[PDB]
Amino acid sequence: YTRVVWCAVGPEEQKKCQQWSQQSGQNVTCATASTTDDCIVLVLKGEADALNLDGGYIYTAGKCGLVPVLAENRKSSKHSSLDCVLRPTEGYLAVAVVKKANEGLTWNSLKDKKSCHTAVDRTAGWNIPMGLIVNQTGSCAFDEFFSQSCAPGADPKSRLCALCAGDDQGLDKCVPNSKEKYYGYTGAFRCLAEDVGDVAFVKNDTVWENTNGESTADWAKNLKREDFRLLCLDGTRKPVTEAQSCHLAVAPNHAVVSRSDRAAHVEQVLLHQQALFGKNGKNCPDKFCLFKSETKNLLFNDNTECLAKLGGRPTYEEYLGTEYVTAIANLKKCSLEACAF
């Protein structure tokens, strides 16, 4: 009744969710799916209530009648007086990242290189960079641009999955969930850091969180910020300190979506949940922290300060902005107004 079913994507998000369910006294319970698209389907069927989604997926869900409820809000030097829950969201920077030692690799020489993407249909990892690449080459053959890639969610037999590694045992190669070694912001950046690919399409924060001792994960332990360069659209290379002037776009934050008819109830429960397990929650350090999962970004990104109310009660279109929405529509016509399911 006053109970929310969260939808977890893959085994590890399932495990974190079960802990949260336990700690919440069953105020929250868990449904699990293998993919984000399958979680969207459970929500439409009314078998789950909610999940936190990247902007590219909000666009998928929004066409199907799902609505943004609360957005991820990270720390900011601006609006610093305003409480996190009421502070406007700032958006993240989509960047292209290379090794400094890979000299003379720039935006203009990306053709036939190796690429690392968060997953197909995601903002920084797919929609922004490929949309730019389609526009620039005047071609929809984006599956032919890079020699090899890890792009979780693409056909496991295509070059777009050639670089993906799967799990501990080599199973689940290229699945769009965290069982895939090179899935997500962290996975894509690991793909570049291990020199599997030449370029990673991630966000600004990913580089900072996985370098200079911020991680302690074995692959990231010894990574230094100075060994990385951002690719800018003017053909130039800059230090990772210069992302404000060398990004591909600003992305709308990840947000919680639900069926319109459930939005009010999902909102109320979630606000109470973060009071308990959020950043300064009554139980977070002590019993359970919603926004931690040791660099793995499970259910929520680890850099989330809070979930913020929206303001202007936006539709999914207003939430994403006319900039981003036209970008996705233009790319989607390479792959007609309907829910995909």
Ligand X SMILES: *[C@@H]1O[C@H](CO)[C@@H](O[C@@H]2O[C@H](CO)[C@@H](O)[C@H](O)[C@H]2NC(C)=O)[C@H](O)[C@H]1NC(C)=O
Annotated binding site for hydrogencarbonate: 118, 122, 124-125
Q: Which does 54 bind (CB under 5 to 8 A by kind): Zn ion, ligand 5CH, Fe ion, none?
A: Fe ion
Q: Based on the shown chain and the rule CB under 6 A, indicate whether residue 327 belongs to the binding site for ligand X.
A: yes
Do 51 and 257 form a contact (C-beta atoms < 8 A)?
Answer: yes
Distance from C-alpha of 281 to C-alpha of 276, rounded to nearest angstrom: 4
Q: Based on the shown chain and the rule CB under 6 A, indicate whether residue 139 belongs to the binding site for ligand X.
A: no
- Interface stretch with ligand 5CH, choices 19-27, 36-44, 218-226, 314-322 (CB under 6 A): 314-322
Output 11 or 321, the one with its CB closest to ligand 5CH: 321
3-state secondary structure of 297: coil
Do 27 and 4 form a contact (C-beta atoms < 8 A)?
Answer: yes
Site for ligand 5CH (CB under 6 A): which residue of 25, 322, 335, 336?
322
Which residue, among 197, 131, 201, 186, has the nearest Cα to 164 in the 3D structure? 197
3-state secondary structure of 15: helix
Q: How far is CA 177 from the centre of its chain?
A: 11
Taking residues 77 to 96 in sequence order and writing x for each that binds Zn ion by CB under 5 A, - otherwise, the string is --------------------
Distance of closest approach, residue 250 Cβ to ligand 5CH, in angstroms: 4
Q: Based on the shown chain and the rule CB under 6 A, indicate whether residue 91 belongs to the binding site for ligand 5CH.
A: yes
Distance from C-alpha of 238 to C-alpha of 216, rounded to nearest angstrom: 26
The closest residue (CB) to ligand X is: 131
Query: H-type helices in the chain, by residue range?
Result: 11-23, 36-45, 55-63, 128-137, 184-193, 204-209, 263-277, 316-332
Q: Which does 304 bind (CB under 5 to 8 A by kind): Zn ion, Fe ion, ligand 5CH, none?
A: none
Which residue, among 331, 270, 329, has the nearest Cα to 85 in the 3D structure? 270
Site for ligand X (CB under 6 A): which residue of 330, 333, 339, 340?
330
Q: Based on the shown chain and the rule CB under 6 A, indicate whether residue 250 belongs to the binding site for ligand 5CH.
A: yes
Distance from C-alpha of 150 to C-alpha of 116, rounded to nearest angstrom: 5
Distance of closest approach, residue 309 Cβ to ligand 5CH, in angstroms: 12
Output 244 or 335, the one with its CB closest to ligand 5CH: 244
Q: Based on the shown chain and the rule CB under 6 A, indicate whether residue 256 belongs to the binding site for ligand 5CH.
A: no
Residues in the chain: 341
Output 137 or 330, the one with its CB closest to ligand 5CH: 330
**In sequence order, what are the beta bridge partners of 159?**
none
Q: Based on the shown chain and the rule CB under 6 A, indicate whether residue 295 belongs to the binding site for ligand X.
A: no
Output 216 or 244, the one with its CB closest to ligand X: 244
Kindly provide the b/e burial profile for residues 211-237, where b requires at least 16 CB atoms within 10 angstroms of the residue's own CB: beeebeeeebeebeeeebbbbbeeeeb
Site for ligand X (CB under 6 A): which residue of 214, 233, 265, 296?
214
Output 208 or 219, the one with its CB closest to ligand X: 208
Q: Which residues bind ligand X (CB under 6 A)?
A: 2, 24-25, 27, 75-77, 93, 131-132, 135, 204-205, 208-209, 214, 243-244, 276, 303, 323, 326-327, 330
